[PDB]
Request: fold
Amino acid sequence: AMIISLIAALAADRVIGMENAMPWHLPADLAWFKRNTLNKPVIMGRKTFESIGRPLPGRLNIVISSQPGTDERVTWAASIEEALAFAGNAEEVMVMGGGRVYKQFLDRANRMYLTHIDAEVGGDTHFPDYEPDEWESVFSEFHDADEANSHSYCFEILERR
Ligand SMILES: [Cl-]
Ligand SMILES: [Cl-]
Ligand SMILES: [Cl-]
Reply:
């Protein structure tokens, strides 16, 4: 039943390291949905957690790591199966760990929030290949660069079909 959502910002197929903890650029007409996301558990890899520097507040943070935990404010898991088990009866879990975390969750995922950013350089990891027949682009919205948008981008919600 659980919504399992990959959230990522992309430069072509390269994952962008976003300054914001949540890697999205939400269009103005979806800003309302940010309020809905605030209680959802987040799952991320260790390197992503270290880049943020602290947990996202007001929600369960689950960090996947093969090393001892370094922050009692988050829940430490050794596998994606353990991470999902910790998420309990949450209606939606958001997965944002690096390319490897995305690849490991892809088969269980059933939603993606993808921010396709133009004129930005990606990082050193690639978003996993996913099968086009398996995923539907249910929502998409482009915005050009302007005085309030440093980069043009397209925000897309995919759902499994
Ligand atoms: Cl919700
Ligand atoms: Cl909820
Ligand atoms: Cl911006």
About this structure: The first strand starts at residue 3 and ends at 11. Residues 39, 91 surround chloride ion (ligand 2) (CB under 6 Å).
